[PDB]
Design a binder for this molecule. Structure first.
Ligand SMILES: [Cl-]
Length: 118
């Protein structure tokens, strides 16, 4: 068993544990540092790395938000897409629900990507 293929499960859990204990100021500092590294990756076209950093930023941003500001049963726009996502329930910093374009698939998205409808 090459459990190393699951490297990101352990990295992800460590990140979430770390962010869950941060103050808002610490999260803002983390996001600023990640954003500066992302800017550098973007300016050099290092796409893979830019994507890794942006996924971390999206997660850090979810820890700054308040899960109670999101409502089960409400439908939101998924940031940077033309999709709509209806929330089934919240757990941690994620909203479990489904996209109106794939209503047979329950799935989870960080609350930071849910935008109130316009
Ligand atoms: Cl995180």
């Amino acid at each position: 068993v090459d459990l190393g293929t699951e490297n990101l499960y352990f990295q992800s859990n460590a990140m979430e544990k770390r962010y869950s204990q941060m103050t808002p100021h610490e999260l803002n500092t983390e996001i600023a540092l990640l954003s500066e590294k992302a800017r550098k990756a973007e300016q050099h076209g290092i796409i893979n790395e830019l994507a890794v950093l942006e996924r971390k930023i999206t997660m850090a941003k979810a820890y700054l938000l308040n899960p109670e500001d999101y409502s089960p049963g409400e439908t939101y726009r998924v940031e940077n897409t033309e999709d709509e996502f209806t929330i089934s329930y919240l757990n941690g910093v994620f909203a479990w629900g489904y996209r109106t374009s794939s209503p047979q698939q329950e799935e989870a998205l960080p609350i930071s990507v849910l935008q109130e409808k316009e």
